C-alpha cells in the first residue's frame, strides 16, 4: 500500500490501516485508533457534480463504491446499517455492467447542492440568486508606535485590494475606546468620516450593543417586500446594517481615506503605564454587529493586535508599569502579576461561544515584542477554525506574506477557504467515534455511532467548523466496540464516511463525501504490524498530548508518553528476554521512538525558554496542520549542500557533527528557515572567493539553497522566519538552539584519563562545544531497549 498516495487521493491518513478486530486487541495495541482528515484537500482524482445526492433515507448512508451491485431488482444494502434501498425510477433505469452512477465507483465526490428556496432569514433574496459573498471585518489596534502603524497601514491597503471586489468589509479601530467607522451612506457625505464610540472599560452585552446601533431586530418589522419603487436597494443587507458593512468595490475610496487618517491613540499615556487598550470590547462589538446583520453567513474577523489588552473585558495585565506580564513560571506557581487572566480567558470563551452559533470565524494577527495575551485569546481560533499569525512586528516577512496568502485565490479566482462547514462522520456497527481534536466543535447530535470514550470534542457525529482551508486537518478518534472475534467473517471490510457541508466563496452549498475501506485483522495480534503508519501515529500522539496538557500537567503527560512508548515497543519488537543485543524493530516502527524523543524536547510540552504566548502559537498551529507540517514542527529537517555530493540535498541528523566548515545547512522547523553557511564557507568569502572568477564553484553553492528555501516558503502557511546567517554570527543562534552536541560530559569524565597528553601541532580545527542537560539520542535508545526487553 501507499499511504502518501492515499492522502493525495482521499485526503485522509490513518495510524492503523489494518484495524483491530476485538476490543481486547484494540487496547493491547496501546495506541488508540485514529486518523487525520483534511476536508478541503486538493485530491488528484476529485470529481465535482450537481445532482440530488441519494441518501440512505432510514440510516443516513450514501451510495459509496462499496455497495451492493444487485443488477436484477434495484435495491442495495446500506453499507453501515445493512438495509435494502430502492432506487428511484430514473436513477437505475440505464443500469448494467457498462453504465454506473458516479458515486458507485469513486469515493471522493464534491457535490454542489442545488439551491433551495430562500429560507425566510435573508428577506429579499430571489429564487435562483447566489448566496452572499464572504465578509472580512478588520479590527485594527492603534496604540502602537507611529512607524509601526504606517507599516500596518501599508499591509492593510494591500489586503483591501487582495480581497475579491464582491466581498463585504467592515472596519473598527480601537485604542482606549472602540470606534465603529461609517462606510455606507449616500454619495452626499463622502468627505467626512464618522465613528460610533463605545466606552472601552465597561461591559456591554451583544443585546445592548445592537440597541445603541439600531441593529436590534424590531418586534414589528414586517413591511414585507411591499415597496414598489425603492431605488436599487441591496436586499441582502438591512438599511440599518448597511452603514457599517459595504462591498469592497463600493466603499473603496472611504475605506482608503480612513486608513491614512489613522494615527496613534491621542489620549495621554503616562510614562509609567501601558497605553489604554480595549481589545476585548473591540471583539465584542465586532461580534455583536455580525450577529444582528450576518447570522449564519460567511464572516471572518481579522484582529490586528499590537500588544497586551489593558482595559475592560478580556484584559490581561494592569496599567501600572512596575508589575510585569505573566510567564510559564508565573502560571505554574500562582503569581499576582496576572490577577485578571481569569475573566480574560473565559470572556474570550463566550465570544467564541457566540461565534460558533453565528458561524463567524476569528483570526488574529498579533505583532509585538511584548506579549499580546495569546494564551487566553487562542480559544476563538481553535473553536471556530481561525488562524493565528504571531510575528514580532507588523513589517517582518512573517506578517506580510501570511496576510497576503490569507487572500490568495485558487485556479478559479475564488478564495482557498470554506465557511460554515459541517463535518459529519458515519461508521459501520463494528466501531464508533470517540471525539475530535482540532479546529472543530461538537454539536450534540446524538446517534448510534457515538462511542462511550471521548477524545476531546465528543458527543456528536457532526462538528461545526466555520473556517477551514486547504491545510486544515482534523484529528478523528475511533474505537472498536466488538467483543469477540468469532462475530466477524474472514476478510470482513468495515467502512467509514465523511461529509463536509460548507459555503464555497462563490456563494453555493457544497457537500464533499469521502469514503474509505479497511479490513479487520485475524485474531493473531502480529498481523496488524504491516498496516501500521508511524508518521500519522506520531501526529496522533502529539495532538493527544497537547490536548491533555490543557487540563493535566505537562509533566504527567511526559510520563504517559514514556510508558506508552515502553508498552508499544515491547509488544511490537522481536527480542530474547533480558537480552538487549537481540533487540530489533521493524521498518514500520524504526523511526517512531525517535519521534517521541523530539516530542518530549519540543516546545509543545516543554515550557522552558519560552513565553506562554509563543507556546500558544505553537499549540494553535499544531492543532490545525496536516501530517507533513506536523512532522516538520516536531523534527527539524537539516539538509546538507557540499561539493562532494552531486544532486539532491542530503538529510543529516541534528548533531554538531553536521556542522561542517565546507557545507551549507538548511534548517526547517516550521517556524525558522535558516540558511547557515559553514566556517570554511565564510573563510573563503571573507576575501570573496565566490566573487572573483577563479573560484566560482562556491558561488553556485551559495545560490543553491536560495531555490529550495524559496520552495519551502511558498507552500507554507503561516510563513516561517527567514534567517540567513554565517558561522560565528549573531543570527546563527536559531540553528544552534536546535543542534544537539555530539559530545556529552558523561562521555568525557567517564574514562580514558591518560592516553591524551603529548602529541601534535597546537590544536585542530576549533570544535564547537554546546552545553545542554538533555539526554542524547543514543542514550535514550539504550534505555528504551533495556526497559522494553526487561518488561
Amino acid at each position: 500500500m501507499d499511504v502518501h498516495e492515499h492522502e493525495a487521493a482521499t485526503g485522509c491518513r490513518f495510524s492503523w490501516n489494518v484495524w483491530p478486530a476485538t476490543r481486547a486487541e484494540a487496547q493491547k495495541i496501546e495506541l488508540p485508533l485514529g486518523c487525520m482528515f483534511t476536508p478541503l484537500r486538493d485530491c488528484t482524482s476529485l470529481q465535482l457534480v450537481e445532482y440530488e445526492p441519494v441518501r440512505c433515507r432510514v440510516s443516513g448512508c450514501i451510495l459509496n463504491p462499496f455497495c451492493a451491485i444487485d443488477f436484477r431488482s434495484k435495491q442495495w444494502t446500506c453499507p453501515f446499517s445493512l438495509q435494502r434501498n430502492a432506487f428511484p425510477n430514473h436513477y437505475a433505469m440505464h443500469i448494467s455492467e457498462q453504465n454506473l452512477p458516479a458515486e458507485l465507483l469513486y469515493p471522493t465526490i464534491e457535490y454542489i447542492l442545488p439551491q433551495p428556496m430562500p429560507a425566510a432569514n435573508a428577506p429579499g433574496v430571489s429564487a435562483g440568486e447566489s448566496l452572499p459573498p464572504p465578509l472580512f471585518f478588520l479590527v485594527v489596534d492603534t496604540c502602537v508606535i507611529e512607524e509601526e502603524l504606517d507599516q500596518l497601514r501599508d499591509s492593510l491597503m494591500q489586503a483591501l485590494a487582495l480581497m475579491p471586489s464582491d466581498a463585504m468589509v467592515g472596519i473598527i479601530t480601537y485604542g482606549a475606546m472602540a470606534m465603529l467607522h461609517e462606510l455606507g451612506g449616500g454619495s452626499e457625505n463622502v468627505d467626512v468620516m464618522k465613528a460610533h464610540v463605545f466606552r472601552g472599560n465597561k461591559e456591554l452585552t451583544s443585546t445592548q450593543i445592537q440597541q445603541q446601533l439600531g441593529l436590534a431586530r424590531s418586534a414589528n418589522a414586517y413591511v414585507p417586500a411591499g415597496g414598489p419603487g425603492a431605488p436599487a436597494g441591496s436586499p441582502l443587507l438591512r438599511p440599518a446594517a448597511a452603514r457599517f458593512i459595504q462591498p469592497v468595490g463600493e466603499c473603496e475610496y472611504k475605506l482608503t481615506s480612513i486608513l491614512e487618517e489613522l494615527r496613534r491613540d491621542s489620549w495621554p499615556v503616562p510614562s509609567d503605564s501601558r497605553p489604554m487598550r480595549c481589545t476585548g470590547l473591540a471583539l465584542s462589538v465586532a461580534l455583536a454587529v455580525l450577529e444582528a446583520a450576518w447570522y449564519q453567513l460567511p464572516a471572518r474577523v481579522l484582529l490586528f493586535v499590537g500588544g497586551a489588552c489593558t482595559s475592560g473585558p478580556g484584559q490581561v495585565v494592569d496599567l501600572s508599569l512596575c508589575e510585569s506580564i505573566r510567564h510559564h513560571l508565573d502560571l505554574q506557581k500562582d503569581n499576582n502579576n496576572a490577577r485578571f487572566v481569569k475573566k480574560a480567558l473565559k470572556y474570550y470563551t463566550q465570544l467564541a461561544n457566540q461565534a460558533v452559533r453565528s458561524g463567524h470565524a476569528v483570526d488574529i494577527f498579533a505583532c509585538s515584542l511584548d506579549q499580546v495575551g495569546l494564551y487566553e485569546m487562542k480559544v476563538m481560533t481553535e473553536k471556530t477554525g481561525g488562524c493565528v499569525v504571531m510575528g514580532d512586528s507588523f513589517s517582518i516577512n512573517v506578517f506580510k506574506d501570511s496576510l497576503r496568502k490569507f487572500f490568495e485565490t485558487d485556479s478559479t479566482g475564488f478564495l482557498k477557504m470554506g465557511f460554515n462547514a459541517k463535518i459529519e462522520v458515519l461508521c459501520s456497527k463494528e466501531f464508533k467515534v470517540c471525539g475530535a481534536i482540532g479546529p472543530c466543535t461538537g454539536t450534540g447530535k446524538k446517534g448510534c455511532q457515538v462511542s462511550d470514550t471521548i477524545v476531546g470534542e465528543g458527543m456528536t457525529t457532526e462538528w461545526q467548523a466555520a473556517a477551514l482551508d486547504k491545510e486544515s486537518t482534523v484529528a478523528f478518534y475511533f474505537e472498536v466496540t466488538n467483543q469477540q472475534a468469532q462475530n466477524l467473517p474472514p476478510g470482513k471490510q468495515s467502512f467509514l464516511q465523511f461529509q463536509t457541508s460548507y459555503l464555497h466563496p462563490s456563494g453555493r452549498r457544497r457537500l464533499r463525501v469521502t469514503t474509505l475501506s479497511y479490513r479487520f485483522a485475524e485474531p493473531n495480534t502480529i498481523d496488524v504490524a504491516p498496516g501500521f503508519d508511524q508518521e500519522a501515529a506520531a501526529v496522533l500522539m502529539t495532538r493527544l498530548a497537547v490536548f491533555k496538557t490543557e487540563s493535566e500537567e505537562s509533566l504527567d503527560v511526559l510520563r504517559w508518553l514514556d510508558r506508552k512508548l515502553i508498552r508499544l515497543v515491547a509488544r511490537f519488537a522481536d527480542y530474547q528476554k533480558d537480552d538487549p543485543s537481540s533487540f530489533h524493530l521493524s521498518t514500520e516502527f524504526s523511526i517512531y521512538p525517535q519521534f517521541m524523543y523530539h516530542l518530549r524536547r519540543s516546545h509543545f510540552l516543554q515550557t522552558f525558554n519560552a513565553s506562554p504566548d509563543e507556546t500558544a502559537y505553537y499549540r494553535s498551529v499544531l492543532l490545525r496542520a496536516s501530517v507533513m507540517n506536523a512532522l516538520v514542527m516536531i523534527q527539524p529537517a537539516l539538509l546538507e549542500y557540499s561539493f562532494e555530493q552531486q544532486g539532491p540535498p542530503q538529510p543529516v541528523l541534528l548533531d554538531a557533527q553536521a556542522l561542517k566548515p565546507n557545507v551549507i545547512l538548511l534548517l526547517d522547523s516550521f517556524f525558522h528557515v535558516v540558511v547557515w553557511h559553514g566556517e570554511l564557507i565564510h573563510q573563503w568569502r571573507e576575501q570573496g572567493f565566490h566573487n572573483m572568477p577563479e573560484y566560482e564553484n562556491l558561488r553556485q553553492l551559495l545560490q543553491a539553497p536560495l531555490e529550495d528555501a524559496k520552495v519551502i516558503l511558498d507552500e507554507r502557511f503561516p510563513v516561517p522566519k527567514y534567517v540567513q546567517c554565517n558561522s560565528g554570527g549573531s543570527q546563527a543562534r536559531f540553528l544552534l538552539a536546535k543542534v544537539n552536541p555530539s559530545t556529552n560530559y558523561a562521555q568525557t569524565a567517564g574514562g580514558g584519563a591518560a592516553m591524551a597528553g603529548l602529541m601534535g601541532d597546537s590544536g585542530a580545527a576549533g570544535e564547537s562545544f554546546i552545553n545542554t542537560d538533555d539526554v542524547s539520542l543514543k542514550v535514550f535508545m539504550d534505555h528504551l531497549i533495556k526497559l522494553a526487553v526487561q518488561s
Binding site: 450537481e50 496568502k405 490568495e408 485565490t409 485556479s411 464555497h504 511558498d714
Partner: protein, 347 residues
C-alpha cells in the same frame, strides 16, 4: 513545404511513445525503466546494459552506408560511428522520446551520464527479451502466436529506437563540425554560443517579436502538451533571450500577457450558472503557464519594466503564491505606460 515536414516528424516521436506504452502494459521493458533498480546496480541490469552497448557496437558498422564525404576517408566513418554512441545524443533521445515520466516510480530526473546509460539498457532490454521470446519452443500454437505478435512488436521497436539513435548521431557529426569551425572576443563568443545552444522556441520568439495576446497565449499552452521538464526549458530560454531586447510598444504587450495569465477572474467571467472547476487538468495548466513564465522573468536580468496600471502589478500579485517572486517583478515594474503616446511620438 513545411507543414508536411513537421507532420511525419511528430508522427515519429508519437508512435514510439504510444509503443512504449503498450510495451509496459504486458510488462517487457521493466528492468531498465525502473529508476530504483538503475541506481541499485542489479546484476541483470549489467547484462542488459552490455547488450545495448554490443548492439550499437554492431549496428553502427553493419547498418550504416557511407554517405557523401564519408565515402572519402576511413576514419571519418569512425567519427560518424563514435558520434552515434556519444553521450549527449543518447540523453537527448532519452528525453524527447518521452521516457522519464513513464518510468516505474520516477522520483527525480536523471543527469546526462546516467540518463544515456538507461537508454543503452533500454536498447539492450528490448534485444534480450525478444531473444527470450524467440527462445521458448512451440508448446501451444496459439500461445506461440500471441508470443509471435509480441516478438515482432518488439523487433520493430528496437530498429525504430536505433534508427532514431543513428539519426541523432548523424545529427551530431555535421553539428560538431559547425561548432568547431570557429571580453568582446572569445568570452562573448562562447557565452552567445551557449545562448544559441539552449534556444527558445522559434515560433514563440517570433510571436513575442510580432505581438498579439491571443497568438502568444496560444503558443504557451500548445507547447505544454510536449513532455514536462523539457517544455519549460523552451519557455524559460525563450523569454530570457528577448525580454532585455524588446521595444516599448511590445513592452506593455508582455504585461498584457502577464495579467490574463495569473488572473482567473478577468478570464472565465461571471456567467449565469457556473461552478468553474470542471477539468482542473486545464486549470492547473494555466497555473503552470503563469509559474514558469513569470519566475523565469525574475531571472531575465533586466531591471526596468512598463505596466499599464496600478492594477497591473496588483493583479500579478493575485494568485500564484506568496514568498520571493512578487518582490522581484513588482520592484522591477516602476515606470508605467502613457500608451496613447507610444503610438504618437511628439518629436
Amino acid at each position: 513545404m513545411a507543414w508536411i515536414l513537421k507532420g511525419e516528424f511528430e508522427f515519429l516521436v508519437s508512435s514510439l511513445a504510444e509503443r512504449l506504452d503498450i510495451a509496459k502494459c504486458r510488462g517487457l521493458l521493466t528492468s531498465s525503466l525502473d529508476m530504483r533498480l538503475v541506481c541499485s546496480r542489479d546484476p541483470t541490469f549489467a547484462h542488459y546494459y552490455g547488450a545495448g552497448k554490443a548492439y550499437l557496437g554492431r549496428y553502427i558498422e553493419k547498418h550504416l552506408n557511407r554517405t557523401g564525404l564519408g565515402l572519402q576517408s576511413k576514419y571519418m566513418h569512425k567519427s560518424l560511428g563514435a558520434s552515434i554512441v556519444d553521450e549527449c545524443n543518447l540523453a537527448h533521445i532519452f528525453q524527447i522520446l518521452r521516457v522519464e515520466e513513464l518510468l516505474e516510480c520516477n522520483a527525480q530526473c536523471l543527469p546526462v551520464t546516467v540518463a544515456a546509460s538507461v537508454l543503452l539498457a533500454i536498447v539492450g532490454e528490448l534485444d534480450a527479451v525478444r531473444m527470450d521470446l524467440l527462445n521458448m519452443k512451440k508448446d501451444v500454437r496459439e500461445l506461440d502466436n500471441f508470443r509471435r505478435e509480441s516478438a515482432q512488436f518488439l523487433t520493430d521497436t528496437l530498429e525504430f529506437l536505433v534508427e532514431f539513435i543513428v539519426e541523432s548521431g548523424r545529427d551530431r557529426f555535421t553539428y560538431i563540425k559547425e561548432a568547431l569551425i570557429l571580453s568582446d572576443g572569445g568570452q562573448e563568443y562562447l557565452t552567445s554560443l551557449y545562448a544559441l545552444y539552449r534556444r527558445g522556441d522559434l515560433q514563440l520568439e517570433i510571436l513575442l517579436n510580432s505581438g498579439s495576446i491571443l497568438s502568444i497565449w496560444r503558443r504557451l499552452k500548445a507547447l505544454f502538451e510536449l513532455p514536462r521538464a523539457t517544455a519549460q526549458d523552451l519557455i524559460r530560454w525563450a523569454v530570457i533571450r528577448q525580454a532585455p531586447r524588446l521595444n516599448r510598444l511590445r513592452q506593455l504587450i508582455f504585461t498584457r500577457l502577464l495579467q490574463v495569465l495569473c488572473n482567473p477572474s478577468l478570464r472565465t467571467g461571471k456567467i449565469k450558472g457556473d461552478v468553474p472547476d470542471f477539468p482542473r487538468k486545464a486549470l492547473k495548466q494555466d497555473r503552470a503557464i503563469a509559474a514558469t513564465v513569470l519566475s523565469a522573468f525574475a531571472r531575465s536580468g533586466v531591471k526596468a519594466w512598463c505596466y499599464e496600471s496600478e492594477s497591473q502589478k496588483l493583479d500579478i500579485v493575485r494568485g500564484m503564491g506568496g514568498g520571493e517572486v512578487s518582490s522581484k517583478i513588482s520592484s522591477m515594474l516602476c515606470i508605467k505606460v502613457d500608451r496613447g503616446f507610444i503610438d504618437l511620438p511628439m518629436d
